[PDB]
Amino acid sequence: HMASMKKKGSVVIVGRINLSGDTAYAQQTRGEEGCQETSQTGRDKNQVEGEVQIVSTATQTFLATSINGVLWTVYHGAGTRTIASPKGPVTQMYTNVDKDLVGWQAPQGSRSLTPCTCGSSDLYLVTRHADVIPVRRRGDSRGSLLSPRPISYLKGSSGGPLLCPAGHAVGIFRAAVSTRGVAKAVAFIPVESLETTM
Ligand SMILES: COc1ccc2nc(C)c(O[C@@H]3C[C@H]4C(=O)N[C@]5(C(=O)NS(=O)(=O)C6(C)CC6)C[C@H]5/C=C\CCCCC[C@H](NC(=O)OC5(C)CCCC5)C(=O)N4C3)nc2c1
Ligand SMILES: [Zn+2]
């Protein structure tokens, strides 16, 4: 009934992948209980830093990546949800189910990656565990892992970046291509598709 209908909570930043120095590592900035309360209110006063955020809903956790002032992630993680911010929930600025893509204005204090113009095919995938995985580009939206590994290691990394050798954003991790549970390739949203959406 209408009186009882509930609202889905906001996506909440719960940590980040630190790429500042010479060592990549995940940092948690909010625990599960604070995440649930922040999802309900949409009010997140935590300071935000860096390019790759770890984000959560009540039921899922994944990544979000700032490129050109937009925090991008996958529709299969975020749906149409708002994101929590210091001033309350922020409505999506971009939503494209056909590309599995959504975006919000980048939070204050985040840093944005620059879209790649190098045309290079030697890529690097950044996971939620701060692994930097070499990936050879195989198409507009596909790349092969130089060292395959179980899909378990990639689960929760959708929304993370594929980067070129120079650290530019080449795409947003979308899906894993698996054979008997082993990931041999990945699918991603190319940054040009982001730049067109923009
Ligand atoms: C609901 O509206 C929409 C709209 C568009 C859409 N487009 C999609 C492409 C789409 O795929 C679905 C989600 C996505 C996914 O799991 N991604 C992540 C991830 O980490 N997720 S996550 O962070 O854990 C989570 C779950 C957000 C919290 C990186 C992969 C890590 C490990 C893989 C585990 C096994 C799943 C293998 C699937 N392989 C696959 O489909 O390969 C095809 C067949 C398609 C392309 C190459 C060949 C797969 O990867 N899948 C299925 N769902 C949608 C849903
Ligand atoms: Zn580049």
CA 76 – ligand 1 centroid, Å: 7
Give the residue carrying structure tokens 């990549």.
Answer: 24
Experimentally, the structure was elucidated by X-ray
Give the residue carrying structure tokens 């309350």.
Answer: 88
Query: Residue 173 carries which side chain, given as an amino acid letter?
Result: F
Q: Which of 147, 148, 145, 195 is nearest to 171 (CA)?
A: 195
**In angstroms, what CA-CA distances link 64 with 56, 81, 147, 159?**
10, 13, 24, 5
Backbone angles phi, psi at 40, to 5 degrees: -70, -45
Q: 135 forms bridges with which residues in the sheet?
A: 123, 145
Backbone angles phi, psi at 41, to 5 degrees: -85, -25
Q: From the CA of 113, which ligand is nearest?
A: 2
Q: Which of 172, 154, 155 is nearest to 163 (CA)?
A: 172
Q: Which of 148, 154, 111 is nearest to 129 (CA)?
A: 154
Taking the C-alpha atoms of residue 162 and residue 154, their distance in angstroms, rounded to an integer, is: 13
Q: Domains in the chain, please, with CATH?
A: 1-113 (2.40.10.120), 114-198 (2.40.10.10)
Ligand 1 site residues, Cβ closer than 6 angstroms: 60, 62, 75-77, 97, 100, 151, 154-158, 173-178, 187
Q: Which long-range contacts (CB under 8 A, 24 or more apart) does 86-92 make?
A: 86/43, 86/44, 86/45, 87/43, 88/41, 88/42, 88/43, 89/10, 89/42, 90/42
CA 176 – ligand 1 centroid, Å: 7
Q: Please check if 164 is assigned to a binding site.
A: yes
Pairing of strands 70-74, 101-105: antiparallel
Residue nearest to atom 9 of ligand 1 (CA): 175
Specify the DSSP element, H or E, that contains 196.
Answer: helix 191-197
Residue nearest to atom 54 of ligand 1 (CA): 76
Do 149 and 184 touch, CB atoms closer than 8 A?
A: no
DSSP 16-58: EEE-SSSS-EEEE-S-HHHHHHHHHH-B--S---BSEEEEE-S
Specify the DSSP element, H or E, that contains 71.
Answer: strand 70-74
Within 8 A by CB and 6+ apart from 11, the residues are: 39, 55, 56, 57, 64, 73, 77, 78, 81, 82, 83, 84
Annotated resolution, angstroms: 1.9
Burial (Cβ within 10 Å: 0-12, 13-18, ≥19) of residue 131: middle
The set of catalytic residues is: 76, 100, 156, 158
SS3 133: strand
Q: Please check if 35 is assigned to a binding site.
A: no
Do 111 and 66 touch, CB atoms closer than 8 A?
A: yes
Taking the C-alpha atoms of residue 24 and residue 157, their distance in angstroms, rounded to an integer, is: 15
Taking the C-alpha atoms of residue 110 and residue 43, their distance in angstroms, rounded to an integer, is: 17
